[PDB]
Amino acid sequence: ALTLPKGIVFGFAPITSTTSSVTGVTRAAPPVATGTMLTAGTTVLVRSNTWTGINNRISVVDANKALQGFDTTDTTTYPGTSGPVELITVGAFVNFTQQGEPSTSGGDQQFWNGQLLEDRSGRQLAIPTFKNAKTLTLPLYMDTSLPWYAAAKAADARGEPVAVRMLLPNGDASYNYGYMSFDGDATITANAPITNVATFTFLSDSTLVEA
Amino acid sequence: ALTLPKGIVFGFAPITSTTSSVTGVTRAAPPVATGTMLTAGTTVLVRSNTWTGINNRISVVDANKALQGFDTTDTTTYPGTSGPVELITVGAFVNFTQQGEPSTSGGDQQFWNGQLLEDRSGRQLAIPTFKNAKTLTLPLYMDTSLPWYAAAKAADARGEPVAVRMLLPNGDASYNYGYMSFDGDATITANAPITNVATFTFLSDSTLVEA
Amino acid sequence: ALTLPKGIVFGFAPITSTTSSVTGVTRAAPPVATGTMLTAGTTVLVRSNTWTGINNRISVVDANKALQGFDTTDTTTYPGTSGPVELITVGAFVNFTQQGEPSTSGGDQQFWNGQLLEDRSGRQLAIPTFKNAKTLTLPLYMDTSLPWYAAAKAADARGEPVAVRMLLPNGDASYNYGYMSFDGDATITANAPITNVATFTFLSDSTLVEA
Amino acid sequence: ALTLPKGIVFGFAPITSTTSSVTGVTRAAPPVATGTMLTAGTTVLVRSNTWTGINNRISVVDANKALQGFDTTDTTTYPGTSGPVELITVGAFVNFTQQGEPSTSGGDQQFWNGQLLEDRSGRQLAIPTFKNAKTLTLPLYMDTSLPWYAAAKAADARGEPVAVRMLLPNGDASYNYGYMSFDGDATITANAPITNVATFTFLSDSTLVEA
Amino acid sequence: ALTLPKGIVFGFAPITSTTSSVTGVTRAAPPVATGTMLTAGTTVLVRSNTWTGINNRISVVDANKALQGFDTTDTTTYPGTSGPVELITVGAFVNFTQQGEPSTSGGDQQFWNGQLLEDRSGRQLAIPTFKNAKTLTLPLYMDTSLPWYAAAKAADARGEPVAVRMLLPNGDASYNYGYMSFDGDATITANAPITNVATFTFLSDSTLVEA
Amino acid sequence: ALTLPKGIVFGFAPITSTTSSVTGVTRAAPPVATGTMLTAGTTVLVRSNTWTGINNRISVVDANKALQGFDTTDTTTYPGTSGPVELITVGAFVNFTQQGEPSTSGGDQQFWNGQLLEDRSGRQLAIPTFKNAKTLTLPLYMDTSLPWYAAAKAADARGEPVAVRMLLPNGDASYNYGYMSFDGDATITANAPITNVATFTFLSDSTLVEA
Amino acid sequence: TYGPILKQLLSPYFSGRVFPDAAPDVPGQDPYVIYQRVGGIPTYFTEGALADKANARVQLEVWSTSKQATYEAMVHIMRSVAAAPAMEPLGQPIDDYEPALRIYGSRVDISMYYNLT
Amino acid sequence: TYGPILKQLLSPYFSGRVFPDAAPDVPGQDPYVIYQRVGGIPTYFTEGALADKANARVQLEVWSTSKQATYEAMVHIMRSVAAAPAMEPLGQPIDDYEPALRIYGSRVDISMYYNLT
Amino acid sequence: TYGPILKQLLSPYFSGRVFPDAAPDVPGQDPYVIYQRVGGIPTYFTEGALADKANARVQLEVWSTSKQATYEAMVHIMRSVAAAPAMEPLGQPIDDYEPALRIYGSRVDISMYYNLT
């Protein structure tokens, strides 16, 4: 056990417009896209309606025809049949270099407050709802003549969601769907070199493409 | 890599009234001002409308006839044709001496808050907008009989934008367009000499005149 | 360079009612009061209307007939002709003794906030206005049988502006126009002697009578 | 110089109802009560109307017939004639014993805020008014069988002003007019003995009966 | 002097319904209940109306027929005659064991704010009113099989005032009338044993049954 | 540009009784006087009959012998051909000092709404007609020995509409015509300095005078 | 330590008995002073140069043979340094005794701004 | 310590009398300098590599025989290091004395960014 | 210290001259490395067991005879440890000199996650 935070390399990719409508996601096994012609090993967004937990997540076509990273065998909260499903292909990944110490922040949960009068001891109830958004920060060391600089600045200016990858040295990954802010401006300090900051934000659940 | 914050010398210049209207900014290459008679090597403001990212930035006429520091080859967010473009010539630069430790502060990003009710887990969305203004501070050591003192006090009293330069010892520069506040009053401390503060504020993007 | 904060002695003087109306302030040179009969070397307030930067400042009649400490050669923001000018003579200065460590506080600048929607990147503008008031504090060591005690208490009770001098050991001065609060009450501490506080506040710019 | 805060012993006294109406307070000298029959050496309140600075202060009848501690020779803010003056005799003083470290707190001054638009530099004005109330604290060590305990508790319960004395070891005094709160309840700590707190508050100026 | 906070043992008792109406409380001496048949040495509440300072205090019948702990010889604020007086007998005391460090908190006093305009110096008045409630905390070490646990939990659930005793090792006591909250839930820490908290609150003055 | 209200000085001047009628008012070009003796720089009241656009406004003589503020090209809204246009000079201008925060008025356009017969879906008529009456309230701080005080205490008794100036820092102006009033004194607020409410009112067009 | 502006200031009382960092081989029974630099506050401009004045915190020690002599020497040093153009005394003296030579000492810190060149 | 970029910078004044961590067996009566690395700030990228430049805080000591010589040597060192491409002096010099050899010392810290390879 | 995963990593450059806590009796003039464990971060589960991996902060020292040799050895150690599966270098090297043997030293801390069994 004890996964370690060493060797983690980040990276982001744009969302293209090529689309498919493969149907046949089976709830029993790790879900399968029946008859898709997409070559096994392409990261593809899933935007299928009529299902709750597969709204805006990201996965890879692998194994025979399945999208590993889903466990939709639970069906008391997963009613109906699959039907039509959207599949948008994601582009290539641009990898950050010269990074600092990532520091995830946020993700607290906001209870409800209010009490039933009848209680003799006047107990106060707390009902959990509305988990806060979870962000990420990743200080970088500035250099204008690097591939990630221009791509990050452009993807900031576009103002559209991207697909963030968090690649462990083991060979796994943790794909996310969310926005991506960038600074692109020097941050002078006492003696440390010029530092540059790239903030993240996740709009859905996280997946794990086991490898 | 690892640009270092040593030997940085600041400086500001007024904005004059001499104007031109050179047309012919080409999107493909580093943009070129066709047929301008301005001598190569003059820092000139650009205030051309109908384009988003070239509103109030500053550059130098160099190479053959181009203004290095622009990368308007992206055109999905840069629609139309150049047409008329304004060019205002900037004066000479007055250099600060006896400076302290610059400390950039600000530049955070203000998300949006709000949630879709339909989510079973009650996920909270964060949408990025409205990046905060980024300032700068630069403590100086007071001396009334110095060239920068009178110029800074006058440029404060005028209440008009100036052009701030951040000259690295390498020979590069990072021109900005923005206001410029000054203190001009003693700040007595325990034992350190009398200190004087000059605050900055940037109203556009930053350019890099490679040299 | 490097003016040092050692040997600084403060002091305040009342504002009398003797008045003159000398005319003829010339913008070109260090301004001159034409034909004034006041003996050279008297600190005199200037309350001349129709000019922006000479409203409530203080200076000394010196040299031949000029009031050193003014640089009204700039005239793009100094329009019109001098005309009538007021001159009120200031009394004698009462010097503080047994002082502590002065600590100037305040003088920050309050920007404007608000953004242009059209910006693709959603840039936020900051416009500088409304610099905060700048105060001063000067702890003293209490003694009832001293000349400054009665004068300071009376000048507090009067509730009128005074003229504050900040005399460097070199022989220069920095006259100010502003109010003057006093405590006049013991401030007992753990073991240090009884301390007494005298707060200042400046209602105009500061002058420097070079000597 | 350098008065030291060692050996200071506090104490309070009630205000009785015996009253007189001696007239003849002379502004020139240290003020004199003409023809009063009160034995020299009795602390007497002064509640004479039609004068600003002698409203609710306390003094002693001493010398020949004067009340040392007043300096009403200034008359530009002291208009009119004395006329009738009230004199209430104060009782005997009960002295605190087993005291801790007094710590005066408060007494700040609340400026005015607001700016004249006409100023080119947008100067902000600060006008001093409304000095805050000045309190005092004096931790004591609890003991029920002591003379000061019952007197302090009763004078708290009465809810009326008293006359606070601050007796220096030199032999001087600093009489005040103000309220007097008491705690009278144990304050248990980690290891220090039980502590008891007595708060003060001054409703007028302070006097100094030189001795 | 110097009472020490070592060996203090707390304890609480319920308030029963047995009542009497003994009359004859004499103001001169330590007050006496004339002709009461209650055995000397029983802690009895006093709820006699028409008197200000004897509203909800607690005392013991001792000496011959007096209730030591009262000093109602002051009568300028104690007008009228005793008349009818209520006496409710209090039950037996349950003593806490395994206690921590008590820490009294609160009991500050809230002045009034506001100023008389006429004052030339603009003095600000502070008028004392409305002393805050004074609480107490007493961390305990949890053990379910102890006599105080069940009694404290039940007396919390009842929601009625109790009578709190603070027994010094000398043999004295300090009875109070007030509520009593309890936690009754584990508070896990880093390494210290499980801790349990019992909060107090006093609704009247405190008495001292000298012994 | 985004200018700010910093040096916005307001002024007024009573109109004299002179009448100068020199024709030359056209529609193709700005109205121009031909060979008049009014040197440029002294403002003129213009109330040309048979021309609605210059009904009750005021400009200043500029060009060589002309007045600006009328350089339109529409023909259906400016009838007639020149006519008896009178030129009334306006007295010496007096500026207010120590101005407060201005206040606008209702900027809502009055309507003319009804109902139509041919509709089957209940469409409601809505025809806005004309803007509502405008007023400007400018609070002003206390002084007595200032010329504008006498000017206002005379202009309130005069009871005539006056030409009002609104000025800008860089030389611009806006000469209008409309009502004004001055309430005198007795505006006593809580703790701010005494103010003097002043009220304007406008009925016609306001010109713009570049300078 | 800037030697000359301290030696010329402290010479008249001690008759030139001021030494840097070390007492001479035979210093005598008369009081003498030893000064030594033990740090300071930087005065280095970020642009790439340092000012012509530099702060320096010096230490001082007087070593007489009688207690009264060293007390007077220390009080004179404190007065002359507190009434000086650019120096300021911080802290209070600390005593010391040397049994082998039977001499009494003292010690106080001084903050001073001297001319680098 | 990156030797060459310090030795070539400080050679002209000291005539090549700069040594790492130790003075030679017979160093002479002329001033000489000893430098030694005593820490720094990390420049290690989290991705699994370290940059081609690395910070290092070096120490410096000048050991002349006369006080004036060491004062001039230290001030020259401070000027030449404050007017340098990538170095910066932090702190102020501290003096020291060695009675056995009768030499005067000095000591100041330097922050420098050198080329790792 | 987990010996094998450090010895096999640092053997090729030093030819197997890595020793735990002590140099051998006759170590020679060639550079060698000494490692020693000086603390770490706990990895103990509260339920009553400890994980199969445990953190440990080791120290390293290279002792050559020439300055260049120890500089190269330290830079190689830093590179090889910063490009490693589970180790990370924290801090910067500190130099040292041993006059008796005339050898130059170095010292740097390493944070590493090793396999307990």
Q: What number of CA atoms fall less than 13 Å from residue F209's CA on the CB side?
A: 23
Burial of A49 (0-12, 13-18, 19+ CB in 10 A): exposed
Distance from CA of D160 to the nearest CA of F (A): 29
- Asked whether I33 and I16 are in contact (CB, 8 A), the reply is no
Q: Which of residues 92-111 of H touch A (CB under 8 A)?
A: 111
How far is the C-alpha of B61 from the C-alpha of B25, rounded, in Å? 13
Q: Is residue B168 within 8 Å of residue B198, measured between CB atoms?
A: no
Whether chains F and G touch (3+ CB pairs under 8 A) is answered by no
Cβ count near C163 (within 10 Å): 20
Q: Identify any residues that bridge with E201 across adjacent strands, giving them in sequence order.
A: E135, E179
Chains I/F: 3 or more C-beta pairs closer than 8 A? no
Judge residue I60's burial from the number of C-beta atoms within 10 Å of its C-beta, 0-12 exposed, 13-18 middle, 19 or more buried.
Answer: buried
Distance of CA F8 to the CA centre of its chain: 15
Compute the distance between CA of residue F43 and CA of residue F68 in angstroms, rounded to an integer: 11
Choose the mutation target among B4, B94, B95, B98 for the interface with G, i.e. most G CBs under 10 Å: B98
Method: cryo-EM
**How many CB pairs below 8 A link A and B?**
73
Q: Please answer whether residues G87 and G110 qualify as being in contact, where contact means their C-beta atoms are separated by less than 8 angstroms.
A: yes
Distance from CA of C120 to the nearest CA of A (A): 7
Instruction: Enumerate neighbours of H (3 or more CB pairs within 8 A).
Output: A, B, G, I
What is the experimental resolution, given in Å to one decimal place?
3.6
The tokens for B154 are 């006058």
- How far is residue E191's CA from residue E184's CA, in Å, rounded to a whole number? 20
Between B109, B119, B174, which is nearest A199 by CB? B109
Q: Which residues face H58 on adjacent strands? A: H37, H110
Tokens matching residue I69: 């040799």
Dihedral class, residue B41 (left if φ above 0, else alpha if ψ from -120 to 50, else beta): left
Any chains having at least 3 CB pairs less than 8 A from chain E are: A, C, D
Give the residue among I34, I41, I43, I36 at the shortest CA–CA distance from I2: I36
Outline where chain H has alpha helix (H).
3-14, 67-82
The tokens describing H16, both together, are 């090549």
Bridge-based pairing state of the strands H18-20 and H33-37: parallel
Residue with tokens 């409800």: A112
Residues in chain D: 211
- Tell me if I31 sits within 8 A of I62, measured CB to CB: yes
Q: What are the CA-CA distances from residue A170 to residues A96, D149, I83 (Å)?
A: 18, 76, 14
User: What beta strand segments (E) does chain C contain?
Assistant: 9-13, 15-20, 43-46, 57-62, 66-68, 87-90, 94-95, 105-106, 109-114, 125-131, 134-136, 139-141, 162-167, 176-180, 195-197, 200-202
Q: How many other β-carbons are positioned within 10 Å of the β-carbon of residue C52?
A: 16
Which residues of D fall within a CB distance of 8 Å from B182? none
- Cβ atoms of residues E16 and E89 within 8 Å: yes
Contact residues, chain A, for I51 at CB < 8 Å: 1-2
Using CB atoms, which residue from D131, D141, D187 is nearest to E1? D141
B181–chain G nearest CA distance, Å: 20
C-alpha to C-alpha distance for F73 and F26, rounded to whole angstroms = 11
Q: Look up residue G26 and give its two tokens.
A: 């035979």
Give the sheet arrangement for strand G33-37, strand by strand.
G18-20, G33-37, G53-62, G108-115, G87-90
Q: Quick check: C124 and B130 CB within 8 A?
A: yes
Q: Which residue of I has its CA nearest to H20?
A: I67
Q: Report yes or no: B128 and B111 within 8 Å, Cβ to Cβ.
A: yes
For residue E3, give the nearest of H108, D115, F196, D185 by alpha carbon: D185
Shortest distance between the Cα of H40 and any Cα of chain G, in A, equals: 19
DSSP conformational letter for G70: H
Which residues in chain H are contacts of I91 at CB distance < 8 A? 39-40, 42
Kindly list the residues from chain C whose CB atom is less than 8 angstroms away from the CB atom of residue B147: none
**Closest C-chain CA to A156:** C121
Range list of H helices, chain C: 147-158
HSE, CB side, 13 Å, CA atoms: give it for residue F4. Answer: 17
Helix (H, G, I), strand (E, B), or coil: what is residue C158? Answer: helix
Neighbouring CB atoms inside 10 A of G4's CB total 9
User: Which residue from A minimizes the CA distance to I45?
Assistant: A2
Q: How many helices (H) and strands (E) does chain D have?
A: 1, 16
Please list every residue in chain G whose beta carbon sits closer than 8 Å to the beta carbon of residue C169. 85
Q: Is I27 exposed, middle or buried (0-12, 13-18, 19+ CB in 10 A)?
A: middle
What whole-number distance in Å separates Cα of residue A67 and Cα of residue A59?
6
- CA neighbor of C77 nearest in space, from I87, B160, F159, D24: B160
Rounded-to-integer distance, Cα B164 and Cα B178, Å: 7
| Token reading at C87 | 């001159």
CB B20 within 8 A of CB B26: no
C37 touches chain B (CB under 8 A): no
What residues of G are in contact with residue H96 (Cβ under 8 Å)? 21
Question: Which residue, among C138, C143, C196, E127, has the nearest Cα to D135 in the 3D structure?
Answer: E127
Nearest CA in chain B to H82: B7
For E175, the 3-state DSSP assignment is coil
The answer to whether B171 and B211 are in contact (CB under 8 A) is: yes
Cβ–Cβ < 8 Å for F56, F15: no
Phi-psi region of C35 (alpha: psi -120 to 50; beta: other; left: phi over 0): left
Query: Judging by beta carbons within 10 Å of its beta carbon (0-12, 13-18, 19+), is residue D202 exposed, middle or buried?
Result: buried
A120 touches chain E (CB under 8 A): yes
Q: Residue F2, class by beta-carbon neighbours within 10 Å (0-12 exposed, 13-18 middle, 19+ buried)? A: exposed
CB-based contact B111:B124 (threshold 8 Å): no
Q: What is the count of residue pairs from C and E with beta carbons less than 8 Å apart?
A: 5
Interface contact H94-G37, CB threshold 8 A: yes
Joined together, the tokens standing for residue F108 give 């809502």
Q: Chains touching chain C at 3 or more Cβ pairs under 8 angstroms?
A: A, B, D, E, F, G
Phi-psi region of C160 (alpha: psi -120 to 50; beta: other; left: phi over 0): beta
G21 to A72, B153, G38: CA distances (angstroms) = 82, 47, 11
Output the CA angle E53-E58-E59, nearest 5 degrees.
105
- Smallest Cβ–Cβ distance between H95 and the set G36, G44, G48 belongs to G36
Phi, psi torsion values for G5, nearest 5 degrees = -75, -10
Q: Is D128 on the interface with F (CB under 8 A)?
A: no
Three-state helix/strand/coil letters over chain I = CCHHHHHHHHHHHHCCCEEECCCCCCCCCCCCEEEEECCCCCCEECCCEECCEEEEEEEEEECECCHHHHHHHHHHHHHHHHCCCCEEEECCCECEEECCCCEEECCEEEEEEEECC
Is H57 near chain A, with CB under 8 Å?
no
* Residues of chain C neighbouring D111 (CB-CB closer than 8 A): 133, 201
SS3 at position C155:
helix
Q: Is any Cβ of chain C less than 8 angstroms from the Cβ of B81?
A: no
Q: Within a 10 A sphere around the Cβ of B2, how many other Cβ atoms?
A: 17
In chain H, what residues touch I97 (CB-CB under 8 Å)? 21-22, 36
Which residue pairs from B195-199 have beta carbons closer than 8 angstroms and sit at least 24 positions apart in sequence? B195/B100, B195/B139, B195/B140, B195/B141, B195/B142, B196/B139, B196/B140, B196/B141, B196/B142, B197/B137, B197/B138, B197/B139, B197/B140, B198/B96, B198/B137, B198/B138, B198/B140, B198/B152, B199/B135, B199/B136, B199/B137, B199/B138, B199/C109, B199/C128
What does the DSSP 8-state code read for residue D73? T
Q: Is F166 left (phi over 0), alpha (psi -120 to 50) or beta?
A: beta
What is the rounded CA–CA span in Å between residue D70 and residue H27? 79
3-state secondary structure of E106: strand
d(CA D30, CA E132): 45
Q: At what angle do helices G3-14 and G67-82 cross, to 10 degrees?
A: 130
SS3 F39: coil
Which residues face F103 on adjacent strands? F137
Decide if A120 and E159 are in contact by the 8 Å CB cutoff: yes
Between CA I50 and CA I43 the distance in angstroms is 6
Structure tokens belonging to residue F42: 């002294």
- C:D CB pairs within 8 Å: 73
Q: What is the DSSP letter of B152?
A: H
Q: How many CA atoms lie within 13 A of C149 on its CB side?
A: 14
C window 164-203, beta carbon within 8 A of A: none
Nearest to G9 by CA among G58, G68, G54, G55: G58
Amino acid in the structure at residue B75: T
CB atoms within 10 A of CB D8: 16
Integer Cα distance of G18 and G41 in angstroms: 25
Buried b / exposed e over G86-110, threshold 16 CB at 10 Å, is: ebbbeeebeeeeeeeeebbbbbbbb
C-alpha I112/C-alpha I117 separation (Å) is 15
Report the SS3 class of residue D190: coil
> Mutual orientation of helices H3-14 and H67-82 as an angle, nearest 10°?
130
Q: Residue F152: phi, psi to the nearest 5?
A: -75, -40
The residues with which E161 forms a beta bridge, in sequence order, are none
The answer to whether the CB atoms of B4 and H86 lie below 8 A apart is yes
Phi then psi for residue I71, to 5 deg, are -65, -45
**What contacts F37, CB < 8 A, 6 or more positions away?**
none
**First CA to last CA distance, chain B:** 16
Name the strand (E) or helix (H) holding D139: strand D139-141
Q: How far is C128 from chain A (nearest CA, A)?
A: 21
Q: Let me know: does E33 contact E48? Beta carbons within 8 Å.
A: no
Long-range residue pairs from I53-57, CB within 8 A, at least 24 positions apart, any chain? I53/A1, I53/A2, I53/I113, I53/I114, I53/I115, I53/I116, I54/I113, I54/I114, I54/I116, I55/I111, I55/I112, I55/I113, I56/I1, I56/I2, I56/I112, I56/I114, I57/I109, I57/I110, I57/I111, I57/I112
